[PDB]
């Protein structure tokens, strides 16, 4: 089992479309009813859903937000009735310090909800977090929740889908501070999926609805095998151990109109495609640390071995000199059309990601020398006296970059 | 060698193997290569029965001196071949194998 | 502790080079090395 | 297997009608579907096509062009859906220097496409190039691709169907430069089929649609035996070794209306006809270097031997004094009507081809003495400083003529 903590407008939407994808996959009706064709289903549902006496299924989700508008719109959707009104929380009434201050203020009810959800699962495995690191809501609230959660639950995993601000595009003027602080908290508490609007929209090209549909696709494909038990990799901890910051790529990212080219898609061509920098959805002979490829559809392990052999000989990849990939196979949901003969998702750890922080650090250093937009931060208690928090966070990020 | 399409691919796959001396050659390895050729070339669209008899044998140097196909036949059909046609085909197959590698050498030089 | 971790490395890596050695001498049983 | 690289309007069309001929021969539907009568076919399809999970077959073709109009028209044809939209490339926005500059500019995506196509074939044998040497697009782009390909893939054949400018007709005013440079690159990198509009249209007489239909006929008849496996000549390298610049001729170049004269066509009369200068589709006791005759239809090797004996005695041909032909047989596709009892195609290497370059050199020398139309060339980086490239190319062509 698992819980999802989605914050800010970004996280709220991310959750909306993630649950849309899930209910589509598992044959769950918008109202929580189960379709007749899926009555005898074999798919495991406990992982993301828990059924109710009324036979309906409820997501293990909690909605958090500093503002009402987004969730109010969500509850006007056809999927509104599905969620649990008890879990959803809205502030009665764009800065990280303010977000953390509110988090300190509203500890009690949030952790009440979290405890209630936790006690309903026998074998909870970890946590899932969806949020954006730039905006005031996501950054600060996620920081506070991560801190108090790692404190509260020292034996549960914490996984996040953190969305990083666009850089080529000059959105949050105060983004460097929030990003740097959120990164501090992620290193200091997060167990383990980086995301950026820049490269994501780049691949989308070459509304937020479609972008986050792709993101939800990534999340669902990541959790597929856990959802669909097989032989190997039957747990999230198995995933994490096989890799341990990450980046992702998915081959069949094709529009509903781009099915006309039914290209004979082997496993070799897919696994190859997952390697190119173009497909890496995120934007010094930098090299890899780990690679995992989850493959959906018919697959012959002989083909997998041949592809691995050929790629190894062709040396299209580079590895650490000081240490000695993985190809897991799953089964598609029996419901969604198998427009793709075989499909592939890749999650990897690669040193080049360091550059991200070097940019943000460069951004942050490009402001701290002139004390820009610190007036609001001084208002909050945390930065009321000084900003030693900022210095510690910057040095922590520098240490991480040095370690990479 | 009346197929031509199949023997072409079969001479490209046995090249990395037969260059080694015969002492390091073992029959159990080549069968996977022969089976690969029959799958890639046009010989796949063929009667499964006759494909069950086509195998390899190791004559008893270099890998280009002990390789040859056999196509063993037993049963009622064995009264037409009578162990002498199979001792004559192999006597022919060498001359068609040599005159086939002496050509793919000369199209490699070219 | 700091001195025994390096002993296991010399001990475990010695047995693995034995496994990959015998698994090579064969006529499957040869595709294991690629695994 | 094989790849086709067609450039410029000439190459784009050439490819269109070549694939039209191929799909006609192999019973491939315009949409890529296979006809019912051809379900059990024995013809080999991997050579030029690769099938898809949707059962459709996709050509191993890539479309390149500096301008959109031609390919846009192609995609409005009934054959549009057949091609692979991924492979097709069009410049977002008539000189060789500009073409090579763009080639330097758009290296990455082109070679991405080429690598993707290459990795889908187990036993790729060589490359096929179709282009015109006069126009800016074909000349420069082919030059750049040949250079970077011979650099990238030092173990693959490179075959071209190069179209030469008409000379009796005064089309590209700057043709001498482009032709000379393309010839430099062809000698310096090309493994191995000359083509000219002048003699081609001469034989056509005695629209581009019909001319290129004839050209595609030549290409398909050249590749027949490779497409249709037999006993001998079961590979392109076998072809090349048996000959090694070339010229071509085809006997049954008859209109759809000229079938009324069903002339009893032996093999002897055909192979004889392939020898005359009239049938050589291109325009010092110059002699031959090599001759190959591929014969389609019923053929008795006794007839072939008799024809060879008689022609040898009649000494209708001349050979080099310092060195010691070939007649290969194939089988017609089982689908297209056998309006011809027996048909013949000839590819030969003959010294007289030297004259071509002597003309172009004479053309080029007729301009370099007065510096005509060099203003545009100076614009590009390659010819920004000097034109030593031109001098080296001219001397290389002179060396080739001397060698002949």
Curated annotation (Swiss-Prot), chains A, D:
SUPFAM superfamilies per record: Tubulin C-terminal domain-like, Tubulin nucleotide-binding domain-like
GO biological process, one term: meiotic spindle organization
Domain of life: Eukaryota
Modifications after synthesis and translation: Phosphorylation at Ser-123 by BRSK1 regulates centrosome duplication, possibly by mediating relocation of gamma-tubulin and its associated proteins from the cytoplasm to the centrosome.
Consequence of substituting residue 356 to P: In CDCBM4; the chaperonin-dependent folding and hence the yield of monomeric gamma-tubulin is compromised
Family: Belongs to the tubulin family.
Protein name: Tubulin gamma-1 chain
Swiss-Prot record, chain B:
Cell compartments where the protein resides: Cytoplasm, Cytoskeleton, Microtubule organizing center, Centrosome
Tissues expressing this chain: Ubiquitously expressed.
Family: Belongs to the TUBGCP family.
Annotated function: Component of the gamma-tubulin ring complex (gTuRC) which mediates microtubule nucleation. The gTuRC regulates the minus-end nucleation of alpha-beta tubulin heterodimers that grow into microtubule protafilaments, a critical step in centrosome duplication and spindle formation.
Subunit details: Component of the gamma-tubulin ring complex (gTuRC) consisting of TUBGCP2, TUBGCP3, TUBGCP4, TUBGCP5 and TUBGCP6 and gamma-tubulin TUBG1 or TUBG2. TUBGCP2, TUBGCP3, TUBGCP4, TUBGCP5 and TUBGCP6 assemble in a 5:5:2:1:1 stoichiometry; each is associated with a gamma-tubulin, thereby arranging 14 gamma-tubulins in a helical manner. Gamma-tubulin at the first position is blocked by TUBGCP3 at the last position, allowing 13 protafilaments to grow into a microtubule.
Protein name in UniProt: Gamma-tubulin complex component 3
UniProt source species: Homo sapiens
Portion of the parent chain present: 568 to 681 of 907
UniProtKB/Swiss-Prot annotation, chain C:
Subcellular localization(s) per the UniProt record: Cytoplasm, Cytoskeleton, Microtubule organizing center, Centrosome
Organ and tissue specificity: Ubiquitously expressed.
Source taxon at top rank: Eukaryota
Assembly and oligomerization: Component of the gamma-tubulin ring complex (gTuRC) consisting of TUBGCP2, TUBGCP3, TUBGCP4, TUBGCP5 and TUBGCP6 and gamma-tubulin TUBG1 or TUBG2. TUBGCP2, TUBGCP3, TUBGCP4, TUBGCP5 and TUBGCP6 assemble in a 5:5:2:1:1 stoichiometry; each is associated with a gamma-tubulin, thereby arranging 14 gamma-tubulins in a helical manner. Gamma-tubulin at the first position is blocked by TUBGCP3 at the last position, allowing 13 protafilaments to grow into a microtubule.
Related illness: Cortical dysplasia, complex, with other brain malformations 15: An autosomal recessive disorder characterized by global developmental delay, variably impaired intellectual development, speech delay, facial dysmorphism, microcephaly, and varying degrees of cortical malformations including pachygyria, thin corpus callosum and subcortical band heterotopia. Most patients have generalized seizures.
Family from the record: Belongs to the TUBGCP family.
Main function: Component of the gamma-tubulin ring complex (gTuRC) which mediates microtubule nucleation. The gTuRC regulates the minus-end nucleation of alpha-beta tubulin heterodimers that grow into microtubule protafilaments, a critical step in centrosome duplication and spindle formation. Plays a role in neuronal migration.
Stated name of the protein: Gamma-tubulin complex component 2
Species per Swiss-Prot/TrEMBL record: Homo sapiens
Taxonomic path: Eukaryota, Metazoa, Chordata, Craniata, Vertebrata
Gene behind this protein: TUBGCP2
């Amino acid at each position: 089992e698992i819980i999802t903590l989605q914050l800010g407008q970004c996280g709220n939407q991310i959750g909306f479309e993630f649950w849309k994808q899930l209910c589509a996959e598992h044959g769950i009706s918008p109202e929580g009813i189960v379709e007749e064709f899926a009555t005898e289903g074999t798919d495991r549902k406990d992982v993301f859903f828990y059924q109710a006496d009324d036979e309906h299924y409820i997501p293990r989700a909690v909605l958090l937000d500093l503002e009402p508008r987004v969730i109010h719109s969500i509850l006007n959707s056809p999927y509104a009735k599905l969620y649990n009104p008890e879990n959803i929380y809205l502030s009665e009434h764009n800065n990280w310090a303010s977000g953390f201050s509110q988090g300190e203020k509203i500890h009690e009810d949030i952790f009440d909800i979290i405890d209630r959800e936790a006690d309903g699962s026998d074998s909870l495995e970890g946590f899932v977090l969806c949020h954006s690191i730039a905006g005031g809501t996501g950054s600060g609230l996620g920081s506070y929740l991560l801190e108090r959660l790692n404190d509260r639950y020292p034996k549960k995993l914490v996984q996040t889908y953190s969305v990083f601000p666009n850089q080529d595009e000059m959105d949050v003027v105060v983004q460097p501070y929030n990003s740097l602080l959120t990164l501090k908290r992620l290193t200091q508490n997060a167990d383990c999926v980086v995301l950026d609007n820049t490269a994501l929209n780049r691949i989308a090209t070459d509304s937020f609805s479609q972008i986050n549909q792709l993101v939800s696709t990534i999340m669902s494909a990541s959790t597929t095998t856990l959802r669909y038990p097989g032989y190997m990799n039957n747990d999230l901890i198995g995933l994490i151990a096989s890799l341990i910051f990450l980046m992702t790529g998915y081959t069949p990212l094709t529009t509903d109109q781009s099915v006309a080219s039914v290209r004979k898609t082997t496993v070799l061509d897919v696994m190859r495609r997952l390697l190119q920098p173009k497909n890496v959805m995120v934007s010094t002979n930098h090299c890899y640390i780990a690679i995992l490829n989850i493959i959906q559809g018919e697959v012959d392990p002989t083909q997998v071995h041949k592809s691995l052999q050929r790629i190894r000989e062709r040396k299209l990849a580079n590895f650490i000199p000081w240490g000695p990939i993985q190809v897991a196979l799953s089964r598609k949901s029996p419901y969604l059309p198998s427009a793709h003969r075989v499909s592939g998702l890749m999650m990897a750890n690669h040193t080049s990601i360091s550059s991200l922080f070097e940019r943000t650090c460069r951004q942050y250093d490009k402001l701290r020398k002139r004390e820009a937009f610190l007036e609001q931060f001084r208002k909050e208690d945390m930065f009321k006296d000084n900003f030693d928090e900022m210095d510690t966070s910057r040095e922590i990020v520098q240490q991480l970059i040095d370690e990479y | 060698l009346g197929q031509g399409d199949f023997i072409r691919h079969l001479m490209d796959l046995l090249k990395p193997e037969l260059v080694r001396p015969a002492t390091t050659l073992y029959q159990h390895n080549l069968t996977g290569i022969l089976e690969t050729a029959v799958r890639a070339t046009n010989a796949q669209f063929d009667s499964p029965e006759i494909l069950r008899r086509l195998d390899v044998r190791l004559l008893e140097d270099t890998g280009w001196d002990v390789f040859s196909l056999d196509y063993h036949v037993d049963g009622p059909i064995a009264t037409v071949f009578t162990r002498e046609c199979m001792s004559h085909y192999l006597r022919v197959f060498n001359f068609l194998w040599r005159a086939k590698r002496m050509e793919y050498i000369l199209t490699d030089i070219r | 502790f700091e001195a025994t971790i390096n002993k296991f490395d010399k001990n475990f890596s010695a047995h693995l080079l034995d496994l990959l050695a015998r698994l090579s001498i064969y006529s499957g049983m040869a595709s294991v090395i690629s695994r």
